[PDB]
Each structure stands twice: as C-alpha cells, then as structure tokens.
C-alpha cells in the first residue's frame, strides 16, 4: 500500500 497512515499503535487512516 503506503497510503495508510499509522497515527499510533493499532490505529490508522486510509486503511483497507
């Protein structure tokens, strides 16, 4: 991917 953004442990935006 590389589009998903990891904000923190166990959490992300733009995930699939």
């Amino acid at each position, epitope marked *: *991917t*590389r*589009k*998903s*953004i*990891h*904000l*923190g442990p166990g*959490r*992300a*935006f*733009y*995930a699939t």
Partner: antibody
Framework: EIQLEQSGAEVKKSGESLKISCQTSGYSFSDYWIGWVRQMPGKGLEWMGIFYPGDSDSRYSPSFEGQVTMSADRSTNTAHLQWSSLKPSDTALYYC?????????????????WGQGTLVTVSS | QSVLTQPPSASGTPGQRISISCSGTSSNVENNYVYWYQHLPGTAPKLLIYRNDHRSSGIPDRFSASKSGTSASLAISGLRPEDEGDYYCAAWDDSRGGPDWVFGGGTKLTVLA
C-alpha cells in the same frame, strides 16, 4: 537513492499566480503521500497538507484549505503546489517531503525524504 | 488541542547533555506517535526519532527520546558544535478526527562556541 528535487527561488508581485515543483526519484511516485511544509522568515515549520499521486486524494491543514492547491503530474513524477493570487504573507521557504519511513510491511507515518526547499518572496 | 509547545531556546556547552521539551495534548502526543526533527542551516529538516523513541538509521546514539503523558523529550548527550540548530517535535493530531500533522514551535539550540 530516494531524492526530491524542488524548483528554484521565486520573486513575485502580490496578486500573481505561481506553481512550484517537486520532482521525485528512487521509488514509485504513485504509491506515497507527498506533503508540503511552510517556513515563514524567522518562524517555524508549518504543515500545509498531503497529496496522494496514485488517486489524487488530498488533505489540507485547516489554515491552507482553499488558499493553495496541491496536485501531481504522473507523466513526470512531479508534485506541485500552486497559488492563483499570491499575498505578501506567502513569502516563505516551502518544503516538499515524502510520508514514509517503511517501518512496517504496509503504511506510512513520518516525513522521511525532503526536498531542498524553494524560496518564494512576494511583495506588493 | 492541535498545539505542540516547545521552549524557544536552549543552550549548552560542548560535552553536556541537554533535553529539548515538547508539550502536547491527549489529541496528539499522549497516544499518537511522536517524531523528532533536526533543522540546520542550509539543510532540509532531518528525521532524528520516530514512533516516540526509535532512532532513525544513521543517527548517532547520543540522540534519544522518550514519552510520558502529554510530554515528550529529546535527549542529546555529548553535545557537539554541529548540533547547533532548530529541533522540532511532531505528531499526528486527531482533533478533526483526521490525520493532521502538527509540528512543535521549535527549539533553537545554541552550542556555546
């Protein structure tokens, strides 16, 4: 080796349009967010937004939404930032940076590779 | 909520340990990953630390970081003249329920020449 190369210094008059550039190398351009960061003279770094070349997705910081436009040319691996009406307060060093790190198999989280910056001076 | 506060200035002499401070909120520093950047004259910002306390490759091990509650700090020991520059914390903030990236205000480190 991953490099971002930004266009040269610009000296503009207020009210003028400007498009600046950031050309990438070393990796799949479509696959990583590109971010823009502003530094006004004597001030700190300030996040503007991220643009995703693969599908033209975007997120603007609230202060920058409607004030500037991010885009990307996939024929030339070039990310752009543009103003239709430059203001004196747009006088700044502007950085382009990749959101990566590759700390896991998937995803991105930190601005890892940075352009050398492009200086814009705007006077009325 | 989307503000990281840093002292504007810090100074030390060659050899010393200094600690650059960054104060955020529950919206960023307490739960989201913190990153640290160094910014020297004529060079783009440089990633020093990622995910709170992991040193980036190539970075010297006299650079360290940690996190407790809404505060983050960057330790630099063996302070060298080359370290003189601006140091920023950074984090994702989710006040808008979105991935907003926030830089701290920066700390201008003087290595006493």
């Amino acid at each position: 080796e991953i490099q971002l190369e930004q266009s040269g210094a610009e000296v503009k008059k207020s009210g003028e349009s400007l498009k600046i550039s950031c050309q990438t190398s070393g990796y799949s351009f479509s696959d990583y967010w590109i971010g823009w960061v502003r530094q006004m003279p004597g001030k700190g770094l300030e996040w503007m937004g991220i643009f995703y070349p693969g599908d033209s997705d975007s997120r603007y910081s609230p202060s920058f939404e409607g004030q500037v436009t991010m885009s990307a040319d996939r024929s030339t691996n070039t990310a752009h930032l543009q103003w239709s009406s430059l203001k004196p307060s747009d006088t700044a060093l502007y950085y382009c940076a990749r959101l990566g790190g590759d700390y896991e198999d998937s995803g991105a989280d930190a601005f890892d590779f940075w352009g050398q910056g492009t200086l814009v001076t705007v006077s009325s | 909520q989307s503000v990281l506060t840093q002292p504007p200035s810090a100074s030390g002499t060659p050899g010393q340990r200094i600690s650059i401070s960054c104060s955020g909120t529950s919206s960023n520093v307490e739960n989201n990953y913190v990153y640290w950047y160094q910014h020297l004259p004529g060079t783009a910002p440089k990633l020093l630390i990622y995910r709170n306390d992991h040193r980036s490759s190539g970075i010297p091990d006299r650079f360290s970081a940690s996190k407790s509650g809404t505060s983050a700090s960057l330790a630099i020991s063996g302070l060298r003249p080359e370290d003189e520059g601006d140091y920023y914390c950074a984090a994702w903030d989710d006040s808008r329920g979105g991935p907003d990236w926030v830089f701290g205000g920066g700390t201008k480190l003087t290595v006493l020449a």
